[PDB]
Each structure stands twice: as structure tokens, then as C-alpha cells.
Amino acid sequence: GPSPEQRVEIVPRDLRMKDKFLKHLTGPLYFSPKCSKHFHRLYHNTRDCTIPAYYKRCARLLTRLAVSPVCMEDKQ
Numbered sequence: 001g002p003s004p005e006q007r008v009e010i011v012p013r014d015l016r017m018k019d020k021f022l023k024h025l026t027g028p029l030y031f032s033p034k035c036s037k038h039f040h041r042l043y044h045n046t047r048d049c050t051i052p053a054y055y056k057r058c059a060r061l062l063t064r065l066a067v068s069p070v071c072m073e074d075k076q
Contacts, residue, residue, distance in 0.1 A: 003052035011052055018052055025059045026066075035071035 001021070003011040023029065031039050042065055043049040048058035065071055 001052065005053045009051055015050075015052065018049065018055065018058070021055055022049075022059050022062060025055065026063045029062050029066035029071075031066050031071035032073065035065065038065055038070055 002014055002017050029039075039062065042061055043058075046058065046061060048054040048061055067076060069075055
């Protein structure tokens with residue numbers, strides 16, 4: 001894509017492509033404000049969601065978050 005997937009870890013602020021891809025790969029993961037902090041750690045700390053190469057691993061890691069009782073009001 002616009003980022004180096006397999007070349008270098010560094011990507012410009014145009015890394016917004018990640019959010020665009022993930023939201024379409026998984027669907028609406030827009031979560032709860034209670035769980036907002038977990039999403040922010042799982043998006044900003046994890047090499048999955050930072051580095052554009054690991055789009056799939058990020059996507060799954062967010063999905064299981066968005067559907068677990070912290071992001072999901074409904075008890076699964």
C-alpha cells in the first residue's frame with residue numbers, strides 16, 4: 001500500500017491507512033469508552049497495529065477485544 005509493509009518499520013503520519021484497512025477488514029470495532037483505553041494500548045503499543053505488515057494480526061487482536069465484555073456491553 002502507501003506504507004512499506006516489507007522494507008522498513010518507519011511509515012509517515014499517512015499510517016492512517018491502517019485504521020482505514022482494519023475497519024474494513026473486521027467491520028465496526030468502535031467499542032465502548034470503558035474499553036477505549038484497551039483499544040488505545042492494542043493499537044499504539046502492539047507492533048501489530050503500528051507496523052502495516054501485521055494488519056491481519058492487529059485486526060484479529062482488535063476483534064476479540066471489541067466483542068469481549070470490556071468493549072461489548074453484552075456478556076458473551
